[PDB]
């Protein structure tokens, strides 16, 4: 592909290689916008209002909304009552990365759906089994079409 | 304490006797004795909870009290019973179909009851002595939990060590631990430990140290609707979807599994089904698809009692081209029992206006009450009820406490009703913008 | 107990190799429609024919949906039954054709028989036995792990694989728990801690299950009943990708995607292949579409295409309109709102209206189902009510009659109470009468 | 499998002279339409002609869809046949032109040749070096037959395929190098040291002979749309099944066209064409007709088969009427095959073929009355009545189906004209087009 | 110099303390009855007692309805929230129209929270993290230094982790807020500028004030600010990301459960005396463009306990309701909804009050106009329309400027009248010509 990049080019023991690709389009912002509207400042109110909207008036805060947290801990079955406040105030992809959770209360309203039972069966299962081969057909289509050796077209 | 005075704030419930016989004026409801008795019969078959999926329709002219009787039924129903009052305009959504919107309303109006047994240990942590296992399995701990009254030392397993390390807890942090279920919380930092640290944390919260006994026992009753279980069991982290509203057309297998295991939960007795009332206000503002789904969706055992209100006469049904009684198809009126309301005479208007004056703290004189009664029977009840408050403000601007006839006359002069506005625009049609987009803006031709 | 204008319907009640009785199974009357539904039920149970459509034609409140419920109850609980309104096909997330096809797949059932040879019980010890000649540069060269399992009336010591120890430390298995290891896949499943080993008396959060019963080595045959639509929606979604977009989609909203025909074809192929081995059994199921006059012409064309297909089951349709315009077409007048080609495809079963004594027997049958006691004079008044007014109005008036009897402290329903309930709850027709009389927008 | 409405056609029933027999391959009559469909079949099988539209027309219940499925059965293996109806084009995430282009690129095929090595032998040892977190996986394999023993290095994907279907030493497995298949044919050592964890009972197999590596050449068929979705994004293979292929760009199409031309010129790939079948073509919009008009004239365009049962009617999206519901510029590019209604002999032969396929025995008089009923109202009505007459006969405990059984079936189940005559006599019973009805008896 | 918009000249209703209306005050002239009606309305809003009140203003175009809405807006003051709104804005393609109406309903209710802002400014002289394990630091002792002195602080692990996030070393000017905990690194100190002759470290001077600065503020938030604060389909609203998230969140239908929970939390904070509730005004201009479905939801939502005062304005006569076919109604308002409303009529004008309007807008925009030029502009305003005269004040000033004059004379007015045409003259030209003007 055409490298739409500006970078460190040579005009002509080791020679170190450092990633330096940049977009030639440069968007210029004044310092006034950044230092007045985005960063905290003594005459700014961004940190104060941000805390007041994210922590003080959060409905998942257990200090002031313990009944709702206990309600949702009955429903979901979380072992920790601060899981709801932590989940509501994390970036979603960071929530994806930090998701690995195995203990759950058995006296909860979270359920194991038939599809989830079948997924737990085909987490690890070999061939010649009916209950796994009826659900692993994407890999069967990948294997029978000789699709790991098709050349790139685009 | 957040709630203010509304148009329907005076109503505290149906004014019934023990024999389902309405008093002339009780609990803010005046007149409508046959309608209130029918609503009381509906209330009793709700409270019995043995009949599923009845449709009852409330019909009457405008400013009669169909909405008033519905929210009176809601007030007499009490808390811990689900009540869903939606308009017909809330059905039409972009990312959810209309049929799924009615299914969400139906399963939002029916719920189950769940009992808790809590043994909570709420106290400020003094010290967390860790007994480090050599192999690392089954780590032991010596928690120093302490309220204002007493202190003792507890024995901790490995997973509670993991819980107290996966959320950071230190000395002086107020927590509560349940013995039976093992639930861990972190209420914050005790107020006695506020001056140790000169600048607070981003997440650090200050809570009072608890009083009295360390270990407390309490039972809690929880009422969860079936729609909340539908939302929770649909997604991995589905409790956010209870609040953002992004549910996204929950499939039928999930609802079928939830229904069958709520049924066997009732069989083993952990839960008890609490039926409720769904109030579809302005049901004439619905498509024929909504009416057909309402007809076929009332024949399930997990269907609430549907109350609908209509002020429409023999008009067309939306989505078709033919006129039908009440703006509803004859299939819906087949599976319906109609509560019919009737207009009021001058005495019922006088008593309702007196009630709404006593609700908004407005002190009405007798002559002003009679003048408001005449304006109510001439134009409408709601115009007079809205005139009361502005008459109060006019009187207060005149440095007076009570309202006289002059404040009501000035309030009648400054603000116009529908009929005077209609005559005042029919007299001068040149100044207003017509249906054909023609207007005369020049004041002199 | 809760009644929802049904569950007096307990099967069709067809006599064996003969006609049906007049008053049986909670049904009164409709002899010919009951015979037709019995023939249809026997055809479904014969498990040969596919893509057969049945349309029920009748007036309002005549027992079409009761007949479909009786078909579903006669077929059994293992035979799937997917009731559906014509308004449920209109989806805003996905096109309507995909909604109809996934309902077709949902109506198909599959029963799978499998065997499981499993080991479970309380663990006594886990010793990672080191190997003789223990290589070089690595400590802990496991030759095998010995796991001692105990349960009720049995206790077995086991010689496992060197590799299963990684699962042992992956699921945090220690002495004092109950595990679950299968013979073929070789995976642990830590069910929880035993009740006897509740050593942390003061504060612990482990789940505690009772010690399992039977021998540790129990081999059993387990049946699983699953629809083909569950197989399609399990194959289509990412099955444990362990990548960023798979967990991204698992934590996000499950948006309904248009499933291609290719996945359906491979699912059908592998299902038929395991049918050939005999290890599965396919059970077709009846699909019920209510007020099919409400469907668009596009839905009827896809219904035609799906009916000519292979795997699609018997579909039962119902309509109350007699001569109406097909929706989506401007001037196509057809019987029952069904286009004449689809009308030619299906078989039509008509349902006659009832009589006075039939209405009376239906009213008293629902009275015994609602567990109310009614005087025969009030029963005759309700029969005359069901003749002069609609039947469902006489049916829905019974519960207010019961409430007005209970507020007068008598179990019997007596004529003044049903007169009071008539005065309290107007009819549809009398509401239309007061609608035409009143000139104040009523 | 199950039996469907078009299951009796097993080909098209023509000779090498393109002359149809009176009854062959499950098809009877329709001599001119059968000869024309055979001509179009041979024109597809030649393959050098592209983008020709063929429009099948006639009355309903004639055999247009039967002729189309007959062409499909005679089309042979490895040739695509995309059979969609008119209403699958309309979607919420795909444009009409894009859905049509996806259909066009599904209907055309690429046959790719590959070179594949076959390795089969007993496993001597397996050494797998996995990282601490299990991410990086590398190792060596030592497979062996009786003539020579070789050691291979393993990659990540082969080792991951080795973990599933757990391969002990002394297991005869078959390795396909290109497809990445691992096929444990059995176990050949039957070792005395047996692990108590493992439950496998794989059968004893003979030790393989001959050379270890065998070269074979294989051919597989993949459509243009599949390669388009594959090259469209990173996870295109999952979107092939879940259908989340949202509006593929034109750059992808241009590059895959150049690529498949390059693969054709190397001898690596071969392009075979296909038949795209649209059923109820009149359901399409006018913009669909314009795009079909300008997309039939492309190099990669299949032989579009088009079916309609409609006379001069309103073309959708327009305010006028056109013959067959298709505008004149699309009718210019299309050659029209016409079909004709049947006589009593052809209807009798159709019903005899249907009864012989449906495992139903009929008498002569029952067949004559079924022929008379079929020529009276419709062929599909009698073809449906064979099933219920069969079920009534097995409910009466007789093997054959008699005249009384089909008379009871005719009485029990209604057709179009009788249901019309029952609706028209009882117009107050059903809901009218103006929504007026009388549910009360009196 | 300040810009002048259409309604800059009006400052308020100009009413007396007794409720009577002065003839020429507040930027208004005439219209005494509607001004007194809106004064009674703003006294009702300042009473802070009732919910769900509605008022419709009826009158012709260019009669001063939006002027009255702006006069109400200034009369309430900046303390009371105000959400002016066009009726076309409700039709949205992301979320349904009724939910947008309810979002505006929550937007017209506001809070006041008193909070203090204490901050620490200066140079990092010392940074000693004390571990006190129990790998984990118990606390960090950081000393700051400015021109007026130095001060030592004791900080938790989370502020230390934020310090390591900002790459703060010894000698960097930082920013620490005590309540929130924000750590911002201004740059390296000025006394450490000659350690190298050239390096990337931005050298900011030492702060001239005290290290510790404390002041109090007031935070004006609305209820809707809170509901969009704790209902994020994708979370992480707190983290400053200059480049946005990879998935754009869509506006969603906020359920009644979150509204009830936010109401409960706000009531808990008010009962502690922390927060004060200020109900506001939702102004919907041109209500005649509202669909009937929005009218039905408005009929439902005017009965809530937390609904604000709703001001609607319309100019139509007997008009079909939008979304209907055969429902004629006054001002495009359906007759069920018009029972809840209080209609205040707005009158047209005559020549003299048009002249006082035109000289007020001449005085505010500081163009000097001659007297006979003013009489010509008043006569031309009576003939054509008012807003044509209002919009031709400024080209007369321009043509006076290009002739090096400061006073507008008659010749400028005729030149602007010849150059710029009204609607009637352009329509007259439109009708006679045949080839599309
Ligand atoms: N039975 C009643 N008792 C007291 N007030 C009533 C009653 N019925 C109606 N109202 C008054 O009518 C006003 C609203 O009536 P509403 O329920 O909107 O009439 P409708 O049901 O015809 O729309 C309220 O201000 C309320 O005070
Ligand atoms: N033959 C019958 N025997 C007993 N009850 C009947 C019969 N037909 C109808 N019903 C009852 O009448 C009520 C309404 O009938 P329904 O099935 O809703 O009419 P439709 O077939 O038009 O939907 C139901 O409660 C049903 O149980
Ligand atoms: N020549 C034929 N051979 C076999 N079956 C036929 C023939 N002609 C008609 N049929 C049958 O007639 C029915 C109608 O044909 P089809 O093309 O599917 O619908 P239509 O003719 O209404 O388009 C089909 O079920 C088909 O099996
Ligand atoms: N009574 C008044 N006094 C002063 N200016 C007025 C008065 N009424 C209207 N105006 C002026 O007329 C201009 C347009 O009025 P506007 O509110 O847009 O008319 P409408 O009520 O039709 O919306 C405004 O800029 C306003 O300054």
Swiss-Prot record, chain A:
Which cysteine residues pair off into disulfide bonds? none
Domain of life, source organism:
Eukaryota
What are the subcellular locations of this protein?
Answer: Nucleus
Which family is this sequence assigned to? Answer: Belongs to the SNF2/RAD54 helicase family.
Q: Anything noted about its domains?
A: The DBINO region is involved in binding to DNA.
General remark: Present with 1110 molecules/cell in log phase SD medium.
Note the subunit structure. Component of the chromatin-remodeling INO80 complex, at least composed of ARP4, ARP5, ARP8, RVB1, RVB2, TAF14, NHP10, IES1, IES3, IES4, IES6, ACT1, IES2, IES5 and INO80.
- Cited function: ATPase component of the INO80 complex which remodels chromatin by shifting nucleosomes and is involved in DNA repair. Its ability to induce transcription of some phosphate-responsive genes is modulated by inositol polyphosphates. The INO80 complex is involved in DNA repair by associating with 'Ser-129' phosphorylated H2A histones as a response to DNA damage.
> Which protein are we looking at?
Chromatin-remodeling ATPase INO80
First and last residue shown, out of the full length, are: 1025 to 1210 of 1489
Swiss-Prot record, chain B:
Q: Which GO terms describe its molecular function?
A: 3'-5' DNA helicase activity; 5'-3' DNA helicase activity; ATP binding; ATP hydrolysis activity; DNA helicase activity
Transmembrane ranges, per UniProt, are none
A Pfam family recorded for this sequence: TIP49
Where is it predominantly found? nucleus
Q: Where in the cell is it found?
A: Nucleus, Nucleoplasm
Keywords from the UniProt entry = Activator, ATP-binding, Chromatin regulator, DNA damage, DNA repair, Helicase, Hydrolase, Nucleotide-binding, Nucleus, rRNA processing, Transcription, Transcription regulation
Q: Which GO terms describe its cellular component?
A: chromatin; Ino80 complex; NuA4 histone acetyltransferase complex; nucleus; R2TP complex; Swr1 complex; TTT Hsp90 cochaperone complex
Enzyme class label: hydrolase
Q: Catalytic activity, per the record?
A: ATP + H2O = ADP + phosphate + H(+)
Q: What is the effect of changing residue 65 to A?
A: Growth defect at 37 degrees Celsius
Per UniProt, where does ATP bind?
A: 60-67
In the record, the effect of residue 66 to R is given as: Growth defect at 37 degrees Celsius
Q: Which InterPro entries match?
A: AAA+_ATPase, P-loop_NTPase, RuvB-like, RuvB-like_C, RuvBL1/2_DNA/RNA_bd_dom, TIP49_P-loop
Gene3D superfamilies with a match to the protein in the record: 1.10.8.60, P-loop containing nucleotide triphosphate hydrolases, RuvB-like helicase, domain II
Its GO biological process terms?
A: box C/D snoRNP assembly; chromatin remodeling; DNA repair; protein stabilization; regulation of DNA-templated transcription; regulation of transcription by RNA polymerase II; rRNA processing
According to its UniProt record, the EC number is 3.6.4.12
**General remark:** Present with 3030 molecules/cell in log phase SD medium.
Q: Which family does it belong to?
A: Belongs to the RuvB family.
Please report the name of this protein according to its UniProt entry: RuvB-like protein 2
Q: What is the lineage of its organism?
A: Eukaryota, Fungi, Dikarya, Ascomycota, Saccharomycotina
- Gene expressing this chain: RVB2
Swiss-Prot record, chain C:
Show the catalytic activity: ATP + H2O = ADP + phosphate + H(+)
InterPro entries associated with the record: AAA+_ATPase (IPR003593), P-loop_NTPase (IPR027417), RuvB-like (IPR027238), RuvB-like_C (IPR041048), RuvBL1/2_DNA/RNA_bd_dom (IPR042487), TIP49_P-loop (IPR010339)
Task: Relate the protein's function as given in its record.
Answer: DNA helicase which participates in several chromatin remodeling complexes, including the SWR1 and the INO80 complexes. The SWR1 complex mediates the ATP-dependent exchange of histone H2A for the H2A variant HZT1 leading to transcriptional regulation of selected genes by chromatin remodeling. The INO80 complex remodels chromatin by shifting nucleosomes. Its ability to induce transcription of some phosphate-responsive genes is modulated by inositol polyphosphates. The INO80 complex is involved in DNA repair by associating to 'Ser-129' phosphorylated H2A histones as a response to DNA damage.
Give the enzyme class: hydrolase
Q: What is this protein called?
A: RuvB-like protein 1
Q: Which cellular component terms (GO) are annotated to the entry?
A: chromatin; Ino80 complex; NuA4 histone acetyltransferase complex; nucleus; R2TP complex; Swr1 complex; TTT Hsp90 cochaperone complex
Give a Pfam family name: TIP49_C
| Localization annotation | Nucleus
Other observations noted = Present with 11600 molecules/cell in log phase SD medium.
Which family does this protein fall into? Answer: Belongs to the RuvB family.
Where is this protein chiefly located? Answer: nucleus
Identify the EC number(s). 3.6.4.12
Q: Which Gene3D superfamilies match?
A: 1.10.8.60, P-loop containing nucleotide triphosphate hydrolases, RuvB-like helicase, domain II
Instruction: Give the species.
Output: Saccharomyces cerevisiae (strain ATCC 204508 / S288c) (Baker's yeast)
Q: Which residues bind ATP?
A: 58-65
Coiled coil located at which positions?
Answer: none
Gene name, per UniProt, is RVB1
Swiss-Prot record, chain D:
Q: Which UniProt keywords apply?
A: Activator, ATP-binding, Chromatin regulator, DNA damage, DNA repair, Helicase, Hydrolase, Nucleotide-binding, Nucleus, rRNA processing, Transcription, Transcription regulation
| GO CC term, one of those recorded | NuA4 histone acetyltransferase complex
Q: Give the enzyme's main class according to its UniProt record, as a single word.
A: hydrolase
InterPro entries xref list:
AAA+_ATPase, P-loop_NTPase, RuvB-like, RuvB-like_C, RuvBL1/2_DNA/RNA_bd_dom, TIP49_P-loop
Which Gene Ontology molecular-function terms are recorded? 3'-5' DNA helicase activity; 5'-3' DNA helicase activity; ATP binding; ATP hydrolysis activity; DNA helicase activity
Q: Where does ATP bind?
A: 58-65
| The protein's Enzyme Commission number | 3.6.4.12
Q: Which family does it belong to?
A: Belongs to the RuvB family.
Q: What is this protein called?
A: RuvB-like protein 2
Gene name as annotated: RVB2
């Amino acid at each position: 592909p055409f490298s739409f990049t500006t970078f460190g080019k040579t005009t002509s023991k080791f020679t170190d290689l450092i990633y330096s690709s940049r977009n030639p389009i440069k968007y210029s912002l004044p310092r006034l916008i950044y230092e007045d509207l985005i960063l905290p400042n003594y005459n700014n109110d961004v940190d104060i209002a941000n805390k007041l909207k994210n922590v003080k008036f959060n409905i998942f805060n257990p200090s002031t909304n313990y009944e709702l947290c206990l309600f949702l801990s009955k429903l979901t079955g979380e072992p920790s009552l601060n899981e709801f406040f932590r989940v509501s105030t994390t970036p979603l992809l960071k929530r994806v990365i930090e998701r690995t959770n195995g203990p759950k209360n058995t006296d909860s309203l979270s359920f194991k759906t038939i599809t989830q039972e079948l997924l737990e069966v085909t987490r690890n299962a070999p061939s010649e089994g009916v209950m796994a081969s009826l659900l692993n057909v994407e890999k069967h289509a990948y294997e029978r079409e000789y699709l790991n050796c098709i050349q790139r077209g685009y | 304490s957040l709630s203010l005075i509304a148009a329907h704030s005076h109503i505290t419930g149906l004014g019934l006797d023990e024999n389902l016989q309405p008093r002339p004026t009780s609990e803010g409801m005046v007149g409508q004795l046959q309608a209130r008795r029918a609503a009381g019969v509906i209330l009793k078959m709700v409270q019995n909870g043995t009949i599923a999926g009845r449709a009852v329709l409330v019909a009457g002219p405008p400013s009669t009290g169909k909405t008033a009787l519905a929210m009176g039924v809601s007030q007499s129903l009490g808390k811990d019973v689900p009540f869903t009052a939606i308009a017909g305009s809330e059905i039409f959504s972009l990312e959810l179909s209309k049929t799924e919107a009615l299914t969400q309303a139906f399963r939002k109006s029916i719920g189950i009851k769940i009992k808790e047994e809590t043994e909570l240990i709420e106290g400020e942590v003094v010290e967390i002595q860790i007994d480090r296992s050599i192999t690392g399995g089954h780590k032991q701990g010596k928690l120093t939990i302490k309220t204002t009254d007493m202190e003792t030392i507890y024995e901790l397993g490995n997973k509670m060590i993991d819980g107290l390390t996966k959320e950071k807890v230190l000395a002086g942090d107020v927590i509560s631990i349940d013995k039976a279920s093992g639930k861990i919380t972190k209420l914050g930092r005790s107020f006695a430990r506020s001056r140790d640290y000169d600048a607070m944390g981003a997440d650090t919260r200050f809570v009072q140290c608890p009083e009295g006994e360390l270990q407390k026992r309490k039972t809690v009753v929880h009422t969860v609707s079936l729609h909340e279980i539908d939302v929770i069991n649909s997604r991995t982290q589905g409790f956010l979807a209870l609040f953002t509203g992004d549910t996204g057309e929950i499939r039928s297998e999930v609802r079928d599994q939830i229904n069958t295991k709520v049924a066997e939960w009732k069989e083993e007795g952990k839960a008890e089904i609490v039926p409720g009332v769904l109030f579809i206000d302005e049901v004439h503002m619905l498509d024929i698809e909504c009416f057909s789904f309402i007809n076929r969706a009332l024949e399930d055992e997990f269907a609430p009692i549907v109350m609908m209100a209509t002020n429409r006469g023999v008009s067309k049904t939306r989505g078709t081209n033919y006129k039908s009684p009440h703006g509803l198809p004859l299939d819906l009126l087949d599976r319906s029992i109609i509560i019919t309301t009737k207009s009021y005479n001058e005495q019922e208007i006088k008593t309702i206006l007196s009630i709404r004056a006593q609700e908004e703290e407005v002190e009405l004189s007798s002559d002003a009450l009679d003048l408001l009664t005449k304006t109510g029977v001439e134009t409408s009840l709601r115009y007079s009820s809205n005139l009361i408050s502005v008459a109060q403000q006019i009187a207060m601007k005149r440095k007076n406490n009570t309202v006289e006839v002059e404040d009501v006359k000035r309030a009648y002069l400054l603000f116009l009703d529908s009929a005077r506005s209609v005559k005042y625009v029919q007299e001068n049609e040149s100044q207003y913008i017509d249906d054909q987009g023609n207007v005369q803006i020049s004041i002199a031709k | 107990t809760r009644t929802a204008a049904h569950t007096h319907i307990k099967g069709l009640g067809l006599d064996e190799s003969g006609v049906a009785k007049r008053v049986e199974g909670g049904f009164v009357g409709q002899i010919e429609a009951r015979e037709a539904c019995g023939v249809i039920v026997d055809l479904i149970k014969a498990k040969k024919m596919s893509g057969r459509a049945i349309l029920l034609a009748g007036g309002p409140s005549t027992g079409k949906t009761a007949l479909a419920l009786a078909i579903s109850q006669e077929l059994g609980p293992k035979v799937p039954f997917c009731p559906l309104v014509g308004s449920e096909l209109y989806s805003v997330e996905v096109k309507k054709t995909e909604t109809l096809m996934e309902n077709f797949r949902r109506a198909i059932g599959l029963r799978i028989k499998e065997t499981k040879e499993v080991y479970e019980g309380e663990v006594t010890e886990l010793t990672p036995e080191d190997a003789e000649n223990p290589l070089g540069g690595y400590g802990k060269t496991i030759s095998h792990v010995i796991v001692g399992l105990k349960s009720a009336k049995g206790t077995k010591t086991l010689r496992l694989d060197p590799t299963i120890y990684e699962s042992i430390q992956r699921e945090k298995v220690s002495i004092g728990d109950v595990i679950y290891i299968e013979a073929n896949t070789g995976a642990v499943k830590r069910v929880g801690r035993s009740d006897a080993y509740a050593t942390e008396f003061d504060l612990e959060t482990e789940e505690y299950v009772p010690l399992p019963k039977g021998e540790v080595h129990k081999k059993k045959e387990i049946v699983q009943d699953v629809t083909l639509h569950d197989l399609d929606v399990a194959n289509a979604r990412p099955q444990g990708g362990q990548d960023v977009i798979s967990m991204m989609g698992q934590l996000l909203k499950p948006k309904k995607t248009e499933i291609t025909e290719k996945l359906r074809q491979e699912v059908n192929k592998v299902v038929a292949k395991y049918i050939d081995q005999g290890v599965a059994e396919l059970i077709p199921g009846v699909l019920f579409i209510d007020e099919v006059n409400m469907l668009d012409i596009e839905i009827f064309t896809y219904l035609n295409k799906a009916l000519e297909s292979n795997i699609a089951p018997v579909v039962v349709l119902a309509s109350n309109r007699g001569m109406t315009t097909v929706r989506g077409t401007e001037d196509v007048i057809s019987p029952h709102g069904v286009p004449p080609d689809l009308i030619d495809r299906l078989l039509i079963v008509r349902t006659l209206p009832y009589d006075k004594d039939e209405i009376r027997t239906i009213i008293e049958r629902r009275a015994t189902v609602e567990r109310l006691q009614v005087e025969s004079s009030a029963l005759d008044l309700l029969a005359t009510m069901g003749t002069e007014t609609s039947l469902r109005y006489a049916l829905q008036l019974l519960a207010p009659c019961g409430i007005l009897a209970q507020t007068s402290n008598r179990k019997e329903i007596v004529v003044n109470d049903v007169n009071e309930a008539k005065l309290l709850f107007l009819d549809a027709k009398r509401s239309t009468k007061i609608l035409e009389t009143s000139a104040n927008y009523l």
